[PDB]
């Protein structure tokens, strides 16, 4: 019945204010025994409860982030917003807006429904296309392409214009200390086919309009 | 299911300046309460009980179109509960209702008053309003008129009843959980008897 | 409001609205009375009756309606039904054909120190000697005598809140102008 | 309140039973929920109040417990039930989620096929050098890559990336990338990555001489 | 209705209808106030009072009256006698006859999230100062001032009712139109205190033009 929608800038610079807004449809933000909640999950780690605001306007916050966090409700637009001041790189995460239902008769409290989620990354880095380097093969042989030093995510990698999919493994991107991403895509092939068959990795990075078709050979 | 009928004991008045119809009516409510069923043979062949209305659940019908705040019946008489689960309740009431007045043909005018009955405590989801059903020769029909006793009814000194229909009105637009979804309206088309106004104003004034 | 629920249950567990609300019977109940005139409804010269819409602010202390806010989550003030507590029986002595006493039992404001404020409304119909000698240019001095009907001054003392009635929320009349007002 | 969810990782197969415990430091009056998160999706509520099943959830999921001890049971597993499972408490603020127990398909022990790749001449043209060691198609996930440069152990200058269980064999691959400056790359001759994994009788080394 | 009976018994165990429902000490209760005009009965110039028939539309949240429908046979809402639950003491402050209260207390609709909606009927005689200068070719400005009688703004916060317009609702089909008055404007406003005992108001204004045909003829 009720639907929650996150929105806000997908990229913020460090030491600035991260702002998000959750729009509620099919339900009033000032009606019913509800807590309008903000949670976050940094990628590959635990979920962290940022805070919530009650329908009366009272707010509760995580003690870890208490000083930097503020939550507000706007009744006219049926919205509630989160502000996190002086953000560092550790504040990069998928942010969720949720509704915690509370019932007194049965003495229960649970989060339902959740928002879809909004991925916010904290980085002063700017867009930069990848450099694509061959990972040249040395009875199955391996070869690949190194997609190095790009920002932001994502990059898509295919082999032979999508005709080669068997044995292809494209690794998740790793964030370097430089703030730029890097990944490798590899494929295992018969060693007998190294002399007869051509292998090309097709790398696309839309934010830079990088389109590279790199032939990989011994 | 709540079956309703109206008996007009007397049409007290229609005040034109205040546009108010004062009537004495007896509202027959009939419904089923299976919790109040018993075997007559297990309880000394008792077939009917008289109980205070505050002891049982009631389908709280009110006059929606009153204009004085008297929404409810005047005298909360006993309910009659039969062994097969039927609850019969005939509260009498004095009702003062809104009746807009068409002055176009006065004193040769006729009016179209209405008594609209609904439940504010319950909606169409919780109760279903319907007209009372009578039987003749094992054939059932609905009572689609205001009941008037030919013997005990005294005609008003100024108004003659021409038509007196009864209708179940359901609003398709309103939601089922709204009190305005359903009502039962009892109408009174009443023609003025202009003899007093004739003799006392019109003939002297015209002459 | 579980704190206020527990507080309200404690305050009225063994409470009496019959006895005067004092620790010791030789003490007097000090009541502050202030009249607020909202509207001058009517001046009936023939029957000598003045009809007014009023608010009868009454303030006292109930010795047995105190609590520590720290013991109840910091609750410092509550609103409770007036019918449950003892109240002064203020009566309009010169009532003509209306109510003698307050009949609209609105809620009282109770502070943690036992202080009670109760500001019920009333329609006062008061008997006033009407001098028609100078009508339509007449001036009328109309009074409202108010007192505890059954309690004498030795058990309940009444004191005016102010020397004048409160006219801050008075609705202007299209027939009369209040030249002067005072409480004695 | 601190919520300790055990075990951190489990392997089960289609049709087997799964049990995940989530102990609580303080007494909770059944104010516990069990969530399921799929890769890349929002967390999905399965159970709340420690026993109530959310609408639209298969009946195989079951929640139980009280006080400080709570359990989630997944009997008659399904292919779609391989996800991360979280326990969340709502007895007091701040709300505390569990560490997260991941359950994935359990398959035959397979050892990695190891490959080492030198830097390309193209990347050396730009002033940096990356050495990539690939571990391909191996289960379980537990594996250790060590880099050696002229038989000298490296530290602090490599990063690892891992795929999800393959959609076909449910095996894992892992890449380790040694990043060195071009100047540093030329001061040493032999570059090696050593791989240890329970399917390997002994550590496997792949190396090249520049 | 045995599930309804059990739910009601659990709902009202330990419940106090005289205590204002504030989740925590210091919380306010938001009360949305709206009006439906069933009939403009009259405007007595001699007594300077407007007689109307209305339905109030009061909405608030009582956290104590929340339950999980899954634990009570899927019951999502209840219809409860208004005397059983806490009510905001919303009255017509500017009544002219001494009557502050509604005509019938009827029943309140309570949702499983504790949201309470109450739509009592009311026959109100409100004070209206008549602008007599242009009678009978006059227009009047008659206000209905609704507010809590006891609770201050720090306890009960009033809002205009809109799902939504800031106006008196008039149903086109069923409205009993007055033969002497035409409704020109019908807005509603929230009046804040000027700025501890201060109270908001919700004022429903009726600007009405007299139809003077009777006085032209007579
Ligand atoms: C000059 C004479 C006729 C006197 C003036 C009579 C005027 C006032 C007319 C106007 C309307 C007339 C009435 C209209 C209808 C009827 C028909 C029938 O019911 C009997 C007479 C009666 C009731 C009429 C009586 C006379 C009447 C009242
Ligand atoms: C009721 O009627 C039956 C016959 O129908 C008779 O036998 C019985 O005695 C009567 N009275 C009681 C107490 O049932």
């Amino acid at each position: 019945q009720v639907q929650l929608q996150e929105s806000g800038p997908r990229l913020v610079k460090p030491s600035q204010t991260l702002s998000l807004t959750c729009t509620v449809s099919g339900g009033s933000v000032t009606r019913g025994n509800y807590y309008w909640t903000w949670i976050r999950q940094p990628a590959g780690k635990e979920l962290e409860w940022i805070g919530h605001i009650y329908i009366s306007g009272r707010t509760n916050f995580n003690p870890s982030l208490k000083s930097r966090v503020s939550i507000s409700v706007d009744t006219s637009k049926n919205q509630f917003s989160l502000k996190l001041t002086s953000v560092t790189v550790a504040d990069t995460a998928v942010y969720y807006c949720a509704r915690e239902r509370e019932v007194i008769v049965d003495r229960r409290r649970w989060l339902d429904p959740w928002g879809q989620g909004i991925l916010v990354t904290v980085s002063s880095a700017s867009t930069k296309g990848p450099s694509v380097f061959p990972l040249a093969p040395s009875g199955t042989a391996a070869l690949g392409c190194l997609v190095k030093d790009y920002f932001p995510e994502p990059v898509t990698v295919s082999w032979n214009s999508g005709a080669l999919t068997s044995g292809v493994h494209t690794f998740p991107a790793v964030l370097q200390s430089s703030g730029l991403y890097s990944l490798s895509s590899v494929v295992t092939v018969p060693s007998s086919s190294l002399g007869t068959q051509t292998y090309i990795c097709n790398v696309n990075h839309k934010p830079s309009n990088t389109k590279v078709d790199k032939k990989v050979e011994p | 299911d709540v079956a309703l009928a109206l008996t007009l004991s007397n049409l007290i008045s229609l005040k034109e300046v205040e546009e108010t119809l004062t009537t004495n009516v007896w509202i027959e409510h009939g419904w089923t309460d299976n919790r109040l069923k018993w075997n007559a043979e297990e309880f000394g062949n008792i077939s009917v009980l008289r109980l205070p209305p505050d002891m049982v659940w009631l389908p709280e019908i009110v006059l929606e179109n009153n204009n004085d705040g008297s929404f409810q019946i005047s005298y909360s008489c006993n309910v009659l509960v039969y062994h097969y689960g039927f609850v019969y309740w005939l509260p009498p009431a004095i009702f003062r209702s809104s009746c807009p007045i068409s002055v176009t043909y006065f004193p040769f005018d006729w009016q179209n008053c209405s008594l609209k009955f609904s439940s504010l405590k319950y909606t169409a989801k919780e109760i279903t309003l319907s007209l009372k059903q009578d039987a003749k020769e094992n054939r059932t029909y609905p009572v689609e008129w205001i009941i008037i006793d030919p013997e005990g009814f005294t005609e008003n000194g100024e108004w003659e009843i021409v038509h007196r229909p009864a209708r179940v009105n359901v609003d398709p637009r309103a939601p089922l959980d709204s009190p305005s979804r359903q009502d039962i309206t009892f109408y009174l088309i009443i023609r003025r008897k202009p003899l007093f106004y004739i003799i006392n104003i019109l003939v002297p004034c015209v002459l | 409001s579980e704190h206020e629920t527990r507080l309200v249950a404690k305050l009225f567990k063994d409470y009496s609205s019959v006895v005067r609300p004092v620790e010791d019977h030789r003490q007097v109940v000090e009541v502050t009375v202030g009249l607020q005139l909202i509207q001058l409804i009517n001046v009936d010269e023939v029957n000598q009756i003045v009809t007014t819409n009023v608010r009868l602010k009454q303030q006292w202390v109930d010795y047995n309606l105190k609590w520590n806010p720290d013991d109840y989550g910091g609750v410092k003030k509550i609103h409770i039904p007036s019918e449950k507590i003892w109240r002064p029986d203020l009566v309009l002595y010169n009532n003509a054909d209306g109510d003698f006493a307050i009949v609209k039992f609105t809620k009282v404001l109770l502070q943690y120190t036992g202080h009670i404020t109760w500001t019920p409304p009333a329609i006062f119909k008061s008997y006033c000697e009407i001098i028609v000698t100078h009508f339509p240019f007449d001036e009328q001095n109309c009074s409202m005598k108010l007192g505890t009907w059954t309690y004498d001054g030795s058990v309940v003392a009444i004191n005016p809140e102010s020397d004048q009635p409160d006219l801050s929320n008075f609705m202007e009349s299209g027939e009369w102008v209040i030249k002067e007002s005072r409480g004695w | 309140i601190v919520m300790t969810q055990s075990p951190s990782s489990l392997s089960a197969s289609i049709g087997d039973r799964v049990t995940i415990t989530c102990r609580a430091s303080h007494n909770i009056s059944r104010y516990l929920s069990w969530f399921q998160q799929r890769p890349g999706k929002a967390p999905k509520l399965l159970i709340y109040a420690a026993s109530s099943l959310q609408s639209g959830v298969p009946s195989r999921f079951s929640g139980s417990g009280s006080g400080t001890d709570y359990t989630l049971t997944i009997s008659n597993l399904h292919p779609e039930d391989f996800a991360t499972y979280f326990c969340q408490q709502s007895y007091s603020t701040p709300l505390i989620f569990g560490q997260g127990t991941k359950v994935e398909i359990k398959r035959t022990v397979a050892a990695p096929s190891v490959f080492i790749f030198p830097p390309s001449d193209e990347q050396l043209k730009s002033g940096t050098a990356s050495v990539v060691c690939l571990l391909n198609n191996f289960y379980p996930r537990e594996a250790k890559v060590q880099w050696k440069v002229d038989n000298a152990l490296q530290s602090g200058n490599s990063q690892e990336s891992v795929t999800e269980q393959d959609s076909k064999d449910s095996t894992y691959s892992l890449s380790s990338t040694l990043t060195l400056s071009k100047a540093d790359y030329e001061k040493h001759k032999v570059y090696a990555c050593e791989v240890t994994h329970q399917g390997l009788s002994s550590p496997v080394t792949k190396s090249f001489n520049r | 209705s045995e599930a309804e009976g059990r739910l009601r018994e659990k709902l009202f165990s330990g419940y106090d209808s005289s205590v204002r429902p504030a989740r925590e000490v210091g919380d306010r209760v938001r009360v949305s106030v709206g009006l439906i005009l069933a009939q403009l009965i009259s405007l007595n110039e001699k007594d300077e009072e407007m007689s109307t028939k209305v339905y109030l539309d009061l909405e608030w949240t009582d956290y104590r009256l929340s339950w999980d429908p899954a634990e009570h046979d899927g019951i999502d809402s209840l219809r409860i006698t208004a005397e059983s639950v806490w009510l905001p003491d919303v009255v017509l402050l500017n009544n002219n006859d001494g009557n502050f209260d509604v005509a019938l207390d009827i029943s309140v609709v309570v949702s499983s999230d504790g949201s309470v909606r109450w739509q009592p009927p009311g026959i109100y005689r409100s004070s209206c100062s008549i602008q007599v200068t242009y009678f009978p070719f006059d227009w009047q400005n008659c206000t209905m001032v609704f507010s809590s009688y006891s609770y201050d703004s720090s306890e009960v916060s009033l809002q205009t009712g809109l799902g939504g317009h800031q106006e008196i609702h008039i149903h086109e089909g069923t409205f009993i139109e007055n033969g002497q008055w035409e409704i020109i404007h019908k807005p509603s406003r929230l009046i804040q205190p000027p700025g501890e005992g201060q109270r908001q108001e919700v004022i429903f204004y009726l600007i009405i033009r007299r139809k003077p045909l009777f006085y032209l003829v007579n």
Side-chain angles (χ1 to χ4, degrees):
Chain A
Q1 310 91 357
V2 68
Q3 321 258 69
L4 311 189
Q5 191 61 251
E6 299 92 326
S7 79
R10 284 297 209 291
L11 193 286
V12 85
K13 322 232 168 194
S15 69
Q16 300 204 297
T17 305
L18 184 160
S19 184
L20 290 179
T21 295
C22 181
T23 304
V24 186
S25 46
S28 162
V29 284
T30 57
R31 195 228 308 293
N33 191 27
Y34 300 123
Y35 295 92
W36 303 103
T37 308
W38 288 100
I39 296 128
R40 75 182 176 183
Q41 204 181 12
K45 302 186 176 182
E46 303 181 353
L47 276 143
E48 203 203 9
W49 178 83
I50 300 158
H52 56 38
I53 185 161
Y54 190 57
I55 54 154
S56 71
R58 176 181 32 97
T59 59
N60 219 303
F61 302 132
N62 207 348
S64 62
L65 325 158
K66 184 111 65 193
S67 33
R68 308 191 296 122
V69 63
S70 98
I71 298 173
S72 76
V73 160
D74 190 65
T75 321
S76 325
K77 315 159 173 103
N78 231 31
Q79 277 170 349
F80 66 103
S81 54
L82 169 69
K83 291 184 198 316
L84 194 60
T85 66
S86 87
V87 279
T88 73
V89 72
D91 288 342
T92 288
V94 179
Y95 290 74
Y96 295 103
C97 76
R99 189 191 68 170
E100 162 153 77
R101 308 168 63 176
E102 177 172 49
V103 294
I104 292 301
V105 171
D106 309 305
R107 285 193 262 73
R108 317 187 155 187
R109 233 171 294 125
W110 72 106
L111 290 160
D112 176 71
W114 283 55
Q116 296 81 39
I118 189 154
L119 179 53
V120 185
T121 283
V122 184
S123 295
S124 37
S126 34
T127 312
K128 172 166 311 331
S131 295
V132 181
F133 304 124
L135 299 164
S138 59
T140 68
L143 58 85
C145 279
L146 172 56
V147 183
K148 191 87 154 43
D149 279 12
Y150 64 93
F151 181 85
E153 307 224 24
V155 165
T156 61
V157 184
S158 62
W159 286 87
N160 292 351
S161 309
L164 175 56
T165 55
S166 164
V168 175
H169 294 83
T170 300
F171 288 95
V174 86
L175 179 60
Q176 308 169 97
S177 41
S178 65
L180 303 213
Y181 294 92
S182 297
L183 66 72
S184 282
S185 178
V186 302
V187 60
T188 49
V189 300
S191 52
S192 65
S193 71
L194 291 187
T196 67
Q197 169 75 50
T198 298
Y199 296 108
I200 299 175
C201 73
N202 319 111
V203 177
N204 187 29
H205 181 242
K206 156 62 73 213
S208 58
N209 193 36
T210 293
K211 289 225 58 184
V212 175
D213 301 311
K214 178 71 56 178
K215 181 178 189 294
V216 182
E217 47 184 2
Chain B
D1 292 304
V2 180
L4 288 182
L6 193 141
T7 296
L8 179 67
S9 181
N10 64 34
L11 201 173
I12 296 138
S13 61
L14 178 59
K15 313 199 280 298
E16 295 89 349
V17 179
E18 300 82 20
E19 294 191 2
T20 303
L21 184 86
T22 313
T23 60
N24 177 346
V25 300
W26 309 344
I27 315 196
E28 181 172 347
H29 309 237
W31 66 92
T32 300
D33 198 319
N34 282 318
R35 302 170 287 178
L36 304 173
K37 274 210 282 221
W38 70 91
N39 290 305
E41 322 68 38
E42 180 172 351
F43 289 97
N45 298 350
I46 290 164
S47 78
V48 67
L49 281 177
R50 276 83 173 181
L51 303 168
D54 46 87
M55 249 172 93
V56 294
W57 175 91
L58 298 173
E60 314 263 8
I61 312 314
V62 298
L63 186 70
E64 203 282 315
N65 68 319
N66 63 311
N67 68 346
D68 60 344
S70 192
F71 276 84
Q72 304 185 292
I73 57 92
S74 288
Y75 171 53
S76 306
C77 63
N78 283 319
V79 301
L80 268 76
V81 181
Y82 295 85
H83 73 279
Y84 56 88
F86 180 62
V87 190
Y88 168 94
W89 191 40
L90 189 75
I94 305 304
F95 279 124
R96 296 175 181 73
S97 68
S98 186
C99 187
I101 297 290
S102 179
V103 303
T104 309
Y105 302 103
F106 175 89
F108 305 98
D109 61 300
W110 60 269
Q111 299 301 333
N112 173 1
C113 297
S114 81
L115 301 175
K116 176 176 154 187
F117 288 102
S118 59
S119 189
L120 300 177
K121 278 206 186 170
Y122 297 114
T123 66
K125 218 182 37 173
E126 282 96 1
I127 60 159
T128 307
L129 299 180
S130 50
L131 288 167
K132 185 200 171 186
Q133 283 181 130
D134 271 338
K136 141 197 289 303
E137 299 176 1
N138 304 2
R139 277 249 281 180
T140 317
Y141 63 102
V143 178
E144 288 168 328
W145 45 87
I146 295 160
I147 294 150
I148 287 169
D149 186 288
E151 296 176 351
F153 181 73
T154 299
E155 180 134 292
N156 180 278
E158 177 142 82
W159 298 99
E160 161 199 302
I161 296 158
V162 185
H163 303 304
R164 45 178 163 106
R167 251 194 188 179
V168 185
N169 307 121
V170 179
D171 192 353
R173 300 294 100 70
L176 188 95
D177 59 290
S178 167
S180 74
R181 177 88 175 157
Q182 60 176 359
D183 64 79
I184 297 187
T185 312
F186 301 92
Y187 310 80
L188 284 160
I189 311 293
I190 46 172
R191 188 186 65 73
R192 198 190 294 279
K193 287 176 278 188
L195 186 66
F196 164 87
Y197 284 106
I198 283 159
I199 298 295
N200 284 53
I201 296 94
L202 262 58
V203 167
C205 185
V206 168
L207 293 166
Chain C
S1 65
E2 189 46 68
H3 283 302
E4 180 165 340
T5 302
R6 292 184 319 95
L7 172 63
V8 162
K10 178 67 195 304
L11 287 173
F12 287 110
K13 194 189 200 331
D14 284 313
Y15 177 94
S16 180
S17 59
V18 178
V19 301
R20 284 183 296 112
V22 292
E23 182 195 61
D24 161 73
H25 74 269
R26 287 161 252 264
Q27 305 169 3
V28 180
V29 183
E30 301 288 353
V31 183
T32 311
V33 182
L35 179 78
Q36 322 176 5
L37 180 64
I38 310 307
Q39 193 181 355
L40 169 60
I41 297 153
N42 186 68
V43 177
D44 184 356
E45 301 79 16
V46 172
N47 277 3
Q48 292 186 305
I49 303 176
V50 172
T51 310
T52 58
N53 175 15
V54 295
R55 302 282 178 297
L56 192 61
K57 188 179 180 192
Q58 298 153 71
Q59 313 168 67
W60 62 102
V61 177
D62 191 309
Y63 176 72
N64 306 295
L65 293 182
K66 301 182 188 169
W67 70 90
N68 187 10
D70 297 343
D71 295 359
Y72 295 97
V75 172
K76 288 187 185 45
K77 85 167 181 163
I78 61 173
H79 294 254
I80 64 185
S82 59
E83 300 106 303
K84 303 167 55 175
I85 63 155
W86 176 102
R87 309 182 304 301
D89 59 327
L90 288 183
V91 161
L92 183 72
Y93 280 56
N94 71 316
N95 176 55
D97 61 355
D99 287 298
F100 284 99
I102 295 291
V103 298
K104 303 284 175 170
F105 289 101
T106 60
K107 284 171 191 192
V108 306
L109 170 59
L110 174 62
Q111 308 284 351
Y112 74 98
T113 62
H115 181 64
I116 289 157
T117 310
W118 180 42
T119 320
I123 297 298
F124 278 180
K125 295 174 127 43
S126 60
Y127 207 87
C128 175
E129 182 183 359
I130 295 292
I131 291 65
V132 303
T133 297
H134 298 296
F135 176 105
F137 308 96
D138 58 304
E139 175 178 302
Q140 301 294 353
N141 179 20
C142 289
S143 65
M144 298 159 181
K145 178 180 171 177
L146 284 168
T148 51
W149 191 251
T150 59
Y151 291 100
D152 62 81
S154 82
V155 285
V156 175
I158 52 165
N159 315 285
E161 190 187 0
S162 172
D163 314 295
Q164 280 202 314
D166 190 9
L167 295 174
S168 62
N169 302 295
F170 180 64
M171 305 195 180
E172 292 311 60
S173 177
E175 291 191 299
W176 295 93
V177 172
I178 293 165
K179 288 301 288 133
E180 202 215 302
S181 67
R182 169 148 206 123
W184 288 111
Chain D
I1 308 184
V2 192
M3 303 295 288
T4 325
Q5 182 173 343
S6 98
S8 285
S9 185
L10 224 55
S11 50
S13 56
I14 300 184
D16 289 345
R17 181 177 181 170
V18 185
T19 301
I20 331 179
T21 305
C22 176
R23 294 183 181 277
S25 69
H26 274 255
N27 170 33
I28 313 180
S29 308
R30 320 188 62 97
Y31 284 90
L32 181 105
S33 298
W34 286 98
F35 292 79
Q36 182 199 247
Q37 204 180 8
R38 304 272 184 57
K41 309 310 199 43
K44 179 226 210 214
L45 178 67
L46 295 183
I47 281 150
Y48 66 94
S51 302
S52 185
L53 199 71
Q54 177 71 353
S55 67
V57 169
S59 162
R60 51 167 173 287
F61 294 103
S62 159
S64 156
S66 67
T68 43
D69 289 345
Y70 297 93
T71 87
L72 173 69
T73 282
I74 327 183
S75 302
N76 155 47
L77 259 172
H78 267 49
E80 301 125 346
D81 300 14
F82 298 118
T84 323
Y85 289 104
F86 294 100
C87 66
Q88 191 250 303
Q89 68 93 40
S90 295
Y91 161 87
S92 81
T93 55
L95 307 200
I96 304 298
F97 293 77
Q99 292 71 49
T101 297
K102 165 180 235 174
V103 79
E104 71 281 5
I105 315 208
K106 183 178 179 180
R107 72 140 296 170
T108 54
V109 173
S113 300
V114 186
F115 304 87
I116 183 135
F117 281 58
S120 61
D121 290 335
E122 295 91 312
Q123 181 179 27
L124 294 167
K125 183 174 164 179
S126 58
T128 183
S130 295
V131 193
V132 152
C133 188
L134 166 65
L135 288 61
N136 209 45
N137 295 352
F138 64 91
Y139 172 103
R141 213 218 82 61
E142 287 65 38
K144 163 32 101 163
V145 85
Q146 290 205 81
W147 285 98
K148 296 111 56 193
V149 178
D150 288 329
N151 222 23
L153 327 181
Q154 276 74 66
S155 160
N157 41 69
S158 63
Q159 296 192 285
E160 334 176 302
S161 187
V162 188
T163 58
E164 287 276 3
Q165 284 199 310
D166 211 356
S167 293
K168 43 180 184 286
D169 59 4
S170 307
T171 63
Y172 295 112
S173 299
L174 179 153
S175 69
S176 179
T177 304
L178 202 32
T179 300
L180 301 183
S181 69
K182 203 155 96 124
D184 291 335
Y185 178 67
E186 293 177 350
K187 330 263 172 263
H188 311 291
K189 293 179 179 179
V190 202
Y191 289 79
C193 57
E194 185 172 318
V195 171
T196 66
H197 184 266
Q198 306 300 135
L200 295 169
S201 276
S202 53
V204 165
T205 299
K206 299 295 175 171
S207 208
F208 64 87
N209 154 72
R210 62 180 295 275
Chain E
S1 269
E2 71 281 5
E4 193 168 321
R6 291 185 254 110
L7 175 54
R8 287 171 174 266
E9 198 203 351
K10 278 167 195 131
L11 270 164
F12 288 102
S13 58
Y15 184 89
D16 196 343
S17 67
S18 71
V19 174
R20 179 176 60 81
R23 194 74 206 60
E24 307 316 326
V25 178
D27 281 356
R28 287 150 107 229
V29 174
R30 186 193 219 78
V31 177
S32 153
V33 182
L35 197 75
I36 296 147
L37 179 66
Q39 184 183 187
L40 168 55
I41 296 160
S42 66
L43 173 51
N44 193 357
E45 295 85 2
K46 300 289 203 180
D47 300 328
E48 292 202 299
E49 64 175 5
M50 177 170 81
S51 307
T52 50
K53 185 180 164 139
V54 303
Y55 288 93
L56 276 169
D57 189 0
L58 301 176
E59 257 169 347
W60 65 94
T61 306
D62 192 337
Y63 76 98
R64 303 168 289 182
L65 304 176
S66 43
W67 66 93
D68 188 10
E71 283 285 284
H72 300 283
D73 303 76
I75 291 160
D76 289 345
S77 67
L78 290 168
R79 277 187 154 283
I80 301 163
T81 53
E83 56 262 21
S84 318
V85 309
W86 176 88
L87 305 171
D89 190 30
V90 169
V91 297
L92 183 70
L93 287 180
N94 69 318
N95 67 82
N96 195 62
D97 53 355
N99 168 240
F100 284 79
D101 310 306
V102 301
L104 197 70
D105 281 296
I106 62 156
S107 284
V108 306
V109 187
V110 186
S111 292
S112 69
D113 59 1
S115 303
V116 187
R117 177 140 144 152
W118 185 35
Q119 291 167 275
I123 303 264
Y124 287 115
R125 270 155 263 282
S126 65
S127 174
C128 186
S129 58
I130 305 299
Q131 311 152 199
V132 307
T133 317
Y134 289 88
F135 171 91
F137 308 90
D138 52 319
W139 61 269
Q140 297 301 311
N141 175 359
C142 292
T143 75
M144 281 189 81
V145 181
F146 277 101
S147 162
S148 195
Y149 196 89
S150 60
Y151 298 111
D152 82 278
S153 57
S154 85
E155 287 170 301
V156 167
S157 49
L158 298 182
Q159 323 290 347
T160 46
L162 62 80
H165 53 179
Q166 263 193 120
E167 281 178 58
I168 299 153
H169 188 249
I170 288 166
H171 208 271
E172 279 67 26
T174 68
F175 174 58
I176 300 165
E177 196 134 287
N178 192 287
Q180 324 191 15
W181 296 102
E182 186 201 355
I183 293 159
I184 313 306
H185 302 296
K186 52 180 194 295
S188 82
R189 289 283 175 285
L190 177 71
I191 311 306
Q192 297 287 355
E196 292 287 300
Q198 265 174 321
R199 228 169 272 120
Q200 295 153 340
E201 287 167 351
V202 178
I203 305 188
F204 301 95
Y205 308 81
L206 267 173
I207 294 167
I208 46 169
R209 199 187 184 183
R210 202 194 297 280
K211 292 178 281 192
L213 180 67
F214 174 85
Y215 306 78
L216 294 168
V217 172
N218 284 278

